[PDB]
Amino acid sequence: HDAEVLDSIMDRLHEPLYEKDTFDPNEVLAENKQLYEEFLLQEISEPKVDNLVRSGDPLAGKAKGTILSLVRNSDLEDIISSIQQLEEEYNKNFGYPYTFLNDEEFTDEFKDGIKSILPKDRVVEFGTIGPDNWNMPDSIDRERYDQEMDKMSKENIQYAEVESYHNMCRFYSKEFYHHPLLSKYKYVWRLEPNVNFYCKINYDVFQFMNKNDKIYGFVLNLYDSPQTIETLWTSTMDFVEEHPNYLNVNGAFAWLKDNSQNPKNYDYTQGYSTCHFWTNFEIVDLDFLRSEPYEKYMQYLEEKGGFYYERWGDAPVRSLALALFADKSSIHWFRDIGYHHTPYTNCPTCPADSDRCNGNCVPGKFTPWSDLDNQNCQATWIRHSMSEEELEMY
Ligand SMILES: Nc1nc2c(ncn2[C@@H]2O[C@H](COP(=O)(O)OP(=O)(O)O)[C@@H](O)[C@H]2O)c(=O)[nH]1
Ligand SMILES: [Mn+2]
């Protein structure tokens, strides 16, 4: 990096995007909702690119990709519900395989249940995660963990004292892509139990990613609970000071530094908006996660112990890495993928004579609870992270 370029990136990473007192968060929220609405109420259909791979084209189905779910035996019914919707809106026409992972062994009744609801030719694989690749490591002082998570539960932080949740966040941050079953894939579509898909997708999504050089796909973009991640930003800035060469000059820096809608988030973390891609859905190019900057960052966070001493989610961790170490024009917003996971929905608008969406979601309604409208970070991403080529992609 040219030293001027780097200094300029470092200056932006060390100041708020908006100066104190030059904005009112209520007016910011209103303008952000209007910008969001202008996008969600725009009639769209499919990406406006000429290279889409249709069902039954020679490249259809040929990406090295899998639908991935980390689930418990007890999630069988809820994951089935998700799978049926993903098949109906997408995968029945493309036939990508499913990979299931669990920290316990899957039962035969789990496997049989999954198979009973899929076509006979659909490939399914089931894997167990080795205990050393899941459990709290020896580096952690369990008694400190207990005391930190006591304090945290008084603040009412969800799952603070659920050890499995900590393990999950860490596994989805830094380990899942090392599981042996995934060594043969370049792409994953992450699927969680109890989600909904609303709109038909008539192109191969992995091939779209590959052909248009996208490393990451998302649908929803949110603020996080700052008390789960008290020191994640400050640690991540220490890592970046030690490895400036990992910075991408076209990183999503404004999105990380936007203090205007939720200034108390930014103050609590001492410099991070807390905006993140909401990873319960994600399309991901595993070559990025396997790359030196991502793996080194993961090691650094492992050493800090914040997966256990705090409640660091996979979503902010993945999102910091993507924003700092990759070109933001490589991160695609799948406007067309109508999708819900409680309590939020991406519900796009179709042309009047289209039957592409099934009508089970209300277009543009992010959430039924207007108090949570200020948890939407999508306006920040639209305003600061999308250039002309992204803005005109739908
Ligand atoms: N195998 C396994 N899966 C887990 C465990 N805890 C969470 N998950 C899965 O990890 C994903 C995220 O967890 P979830 O409970 O949905 O958390 P939330 O979406 O963050 O509320 C989902 O696919 C869960 O099924 C666990 O202890 N074992
Ligand atoms: Mn979930």
Author numbering: 71 to 464
From the paper:
Ktr4p is a member of the Kre2/Mnt1 family of glycosyltransferases. Ktr4p, as the other members of the Kre2/Mnt1 family, is a type II membrane protein with a short N-terminal cytosolic tail and a large lumenal catalytic domain of 40 kDa, which is separated from the membrane by a stalk domain of 11 kDa. Ktr4p, with its large central β-sheet, belongs to the GT-A fold class of glycosyltransferases. We used GDP-mannose as the sugar donor, and tested mannose, α-1,2-mannobiose and methyl-α-mannoside as potential acceptors; in the case of both donor and acceptor this was based on suggestions from sequence identity. Our results, shown in Fig 4, confirm that Ktr4p is an active mannosyltransferase enzyme.
We have formed the complex of Ktr4p and GDP and Mn2+ by soaking crystals of the apo-form, and solved the structure of this complex to 1.9 Å resolution. Both ligands bind in the previously described active-site cleft, which is situated on the surface of the protein, as seen in Fig 2. The most noticeable difference, apart from the GDP itself, is the presence of a Mn2+ ion bound in the active site of each monomer in the complex. The Mn2+ ion in the active site is hexahedrally coordinated. The metal ion interacts with the OE1 of Glu-262 at a distance of 2.2 Å, the NE2 of His-411 (2.4 Å), water molecules 1 and 2 (both at 2.4 Å distance), as well as the O1 of the α- (2.3 Å) and the O1 of the β-phosphate (2.2 Å). O1 of the β-phosphate interacts with the OH of Tyr-229 at a distance of 2.7 Å, and O2 of the β-phosphate interacts with the OH of Tyr-235 at a distance of 2.7 Å. The guanine moiety of the GDP makes hydrogen bonds to three residues of the enzyme via its nitrogen atoms; N1 interacts with OD1 of Asp-173 at 2.7 Å distance, while N2 interacts with the same atom (3.2 Å distance), OD1 of Asn-172 (2.9 Å) and the main chain O of Val-141 (3.0 Å). Only slight changes in sidechain conformation can be observed upon ligand binding in the active site, most notably the position of Arg-142 changes upon ligand binding to free space for the nucleotide base and interact with it via a stacking interaction, meaning the gross structure of the active site pocket is preformed in the proteins apo-state despite the absence of the Mn2+ ion. In the complex structure Glu-262 is coordinating the active site Mn2+ ion via its OE1 atom, while Asn-264 is on the surface of the monomer and is indirectly interacting with the second chain of the ‘dimer’ via two water molecules. Despite extensive efforts to produce a structure of Ktr4p in complex with GDP-mannose, both by co-crystallisation and by soaking native crystals with GDP-mannose, we have not been able to observe the non-hydrolysed state of the ligand, but only the GDP moiety.
